[PDB]
Ligand binder design. Structure first.
Ligand code: B12
Ligand code: SA8
Ligand code: TRP
Ligand code: SF4
Length: 542
């Protein structure tokens, strides 16, 4: 048999197409395998029926599950998804004896812990298209898997990784894991394949990857480890081919899925040049209606980059400025060498250049990192609000993960013998004592503590700066900083009982409605006029 099943357990709406499965499908099929996708995003109330019918009819020899999100990563909410993922995986193993392999960005933040927690045979950390093809080949040919480089295997004593070596595989480049040549085929209306048009009609977005990895080391961010610490760039022609394929299907709003679009800047500029060239070469090319949405850091973002974004069809930029105070940004928004890489001028210039070219902007602020006080919060709010960005998103509190510098540093402070100031969890019974990796018997133990307590219960560990103590009181003080005239243009942690204003797209009811109302683009691009969109919605409901 050469049949591989790939399952999407993501239930979050507004729906986001599981891009990962399209990458894996292309790689597998190019290797001569047959691939079928079971997408449960639109089968929330009857996914068991979807599983029952499939496994009675088909016999895949390997089942793959993509775990995009471990949780919402919203410190005030602490809503896990891995329990619901485990429930789906448990139903799968009930229905078949074929091995199960796990993967995903969120999966790669704690792959050893999840392999043991899900109780599955295999897992991959980072990009999986090359490792999965070798795994499927080994299973199909009846071969041993003990020599598959990069494969995490679930032994009877626990999850153990084949070296590609850090036993955790932390902070590797992972460029060798990336398929840098192929066009990732994006299909629509095809049974048992990812239905990209369905996601566009119902959620509002398409997606495009230009490069894997991030070379920086921001203390809050899981991506350098979970994705890779060096850039694996794709062929530009293959990227633009895929974008043209999406545009041809009518998927005009495309969100880049790079860690940061403007990092590895020469490749991003050469990408925009190729898009502009094809747009100019033929007016019928559907890229002429492209609406590109991107992630950026405040630097590098120069006038040439801004001109290219405008000409290629960029419609909005989300910039993770995160803060203004150098005392807070130091040791936080840093490169691998430990130095900062932007100032507030860079965000000011980014917002100005996008304004001059009719490109919308969202500026991110993350409150509660070490050093944060009420006066540091007020300083960031006053300065950020004066940028006149389209949307200004204020988040408060940090979710800790085993392979972020904050996760490691706070585990260092605990040293396995005491709790650390600022540690928080909504489900904690007493002191949260974390253990550094070197004090743990296995990767699984070091990784699991950031999500579970000793008794196996969910205990999603967060950090809140003790300087924000007299952490809900800070929310009321943060709301007071925003002028009522500016309420419409901010995202904020929501006070008691109010409608959702949070910078949180996971099951946001207003954002869930936009698809049915025909709105598209980044989920923040219509935040400003939500009052009018709601008024208009009840006008056609009557
Ligand atoms: C773009 C983006 C978004 C966009 C999506 C745009 C779109 N139309 O696709 C928006 C803004 C909507 C968004 C929303 C959210 N996101 Co987001 N987002 C990203 C980002 C930057 C790229 C995701 C992506 O598509 N990558 C490209 C795909 C192809 O790669 P991949 O999924 O990782 O897949 C590869 C590997 O993981 C592997 N793999 C994957 N699955 C499998 C399966 C198997 C079996 C195997 C073997 C291998 C394997 O192989 C794949 C091919 O190389 C990621 C970080 C990142 N750099 O990936 C964050 C990220 C995934 N998002 C994150 C979060 C928290 C969210 C939200 C929950 C935020 C919120 N509270 O609303 C929501 C969830 C929305 C949803 N419906 O699921 C977190 C996840 C953290 C965690 N621990 O899980 C990340 C890591 C951001 C961060 N730095 O913390 N997101
Ligand atoms: C959008 N981010 C930059 C783009 C990045 N590629 C990503 O998808 O996270 C920055 C924002 O992500 C959020 N964020 C990232 N990691 C965490 C985390 N561990 N806890 C809380 N918020 C986080 C913060 O709001 C931060 O301002
Ligand atoms: N603010 C992000 C989405 C988001 C919300 N909460 C998050 C937590 C972690 C990472 C991203 C997010 C955006 O506008 O695109
Ligand atoms: S915040 Fe952006 S630049 Fe910093 S590590 Fe994460 S993805 Fe890279």
């Amino acid at each position: 048999s050469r049949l591989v099943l790939l399952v999407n357990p993501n239930k979050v709406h507004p729906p986001i197409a599981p891009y990962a499965l399209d990458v894996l499908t292309t790689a597998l099929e190019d290797e001569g395998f047959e691939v079928e996708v079971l997408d449960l995003t639109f089968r929330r109330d009857d996914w068991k029926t979807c599983l029952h019918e499939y496994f009675a009819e088909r016999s895949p020899m390997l089942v793959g599950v993509t775990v995009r999100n471990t949780d919402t990563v919203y410190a005030f909410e602490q809503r896990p998804f891995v329990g619901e993922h485990r429930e789906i995986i448990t139903e799968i193993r009930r229905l078949t004896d074929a091995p199960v392999v796990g993967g995903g960005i969120g999966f790669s933040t704690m792959p050893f812990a999840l392999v043991e927690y899900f109780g599955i045979e295999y897992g991959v950390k980072g990009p999986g298209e090359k490792i999965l093809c070798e795994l499927a080949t080994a299973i199909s040919e009846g071969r041993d898997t003990a020599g598959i480089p990069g494969l995490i295997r679930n032994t009877e004593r626990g999850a153990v990784r084949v070296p590609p070596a850090e036993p955790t595989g932390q902070f590797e480049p992972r460029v060798w894991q990336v398929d840098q040549l192929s066009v990732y085929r994006r299909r629509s209306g095809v049974p048992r394949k990812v239905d990209n048009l369905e996601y566009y009609r119902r959620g509002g977005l398409g997606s495009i990857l230009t490069k894997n990895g991030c070379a920086y080391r921001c203390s809050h961010c899981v991506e350098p480890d979970a994705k890779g610490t060096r850039y694996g760039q794709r062929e530009l022609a293959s990227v633009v081919d895929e974008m043209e394929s999406l545009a041809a299907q009518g998927i005009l709003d495309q969100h880049t899925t790079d860690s940061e679009f403007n990092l590895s800047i020469a490749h991003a500029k050469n990408l925009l040049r190729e898009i502009v060239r094809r747009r100019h070469a033929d007016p019928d090319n559907p890229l002429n209606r492209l609406r590109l949405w991107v992630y950026c850091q405040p630097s590098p973002f120069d006038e040439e980059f801004a001109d290219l974004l405008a000409a290629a069809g960029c419609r909005g930029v989300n910039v993770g400025s995160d803060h203004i105070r150098p005392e807070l940004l130091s040791g936080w928004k840093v490169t691998e060498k430990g130095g900062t890489y932007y100032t507030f001028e860079d965000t000011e210039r980014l917002v100005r250049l996008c304004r001059e070219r009719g490109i919308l902007t969202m500026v991110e602020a993350l409150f509660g990192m070490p050093g944060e006080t009420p006066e540091t919060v007020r300083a960031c709010v006053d300065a950020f609000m004066a940028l006149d960005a389209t949307v200004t998103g204020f988040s408060l509190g940090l979710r800790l993960f085993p392979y972020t510098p904050m996760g490691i540093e706070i585990a260092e402070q605990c040293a396995g013998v005491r709790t650390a100031p600022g540690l928080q969890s909504n489900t904690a019974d007493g002191p949260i004592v974390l253990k550094p990796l070197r004090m743990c018997a296995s990767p699984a133990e070091y990784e699991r503590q950031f999500m579970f307590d000793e008794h196996g219960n969910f205990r999603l560990v967060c950090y809140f700066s003790p300087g924000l103590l007299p952490w809900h009181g800070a929310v009321a003080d943060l709301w007071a900083l925003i002028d009522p005239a500016d309420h419409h243009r901010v995202m904020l942690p929501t006070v008691e009982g109010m409608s959702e204003h949070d910078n949180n797209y996971a099951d946001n009811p207003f954002l869930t409605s936009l698809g049915g109302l025909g709105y598209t683009g980044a989920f923040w691009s219509h935040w400003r006029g939500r009052e009018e969109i709601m008024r208009k919605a009840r006008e056609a409901a009557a």
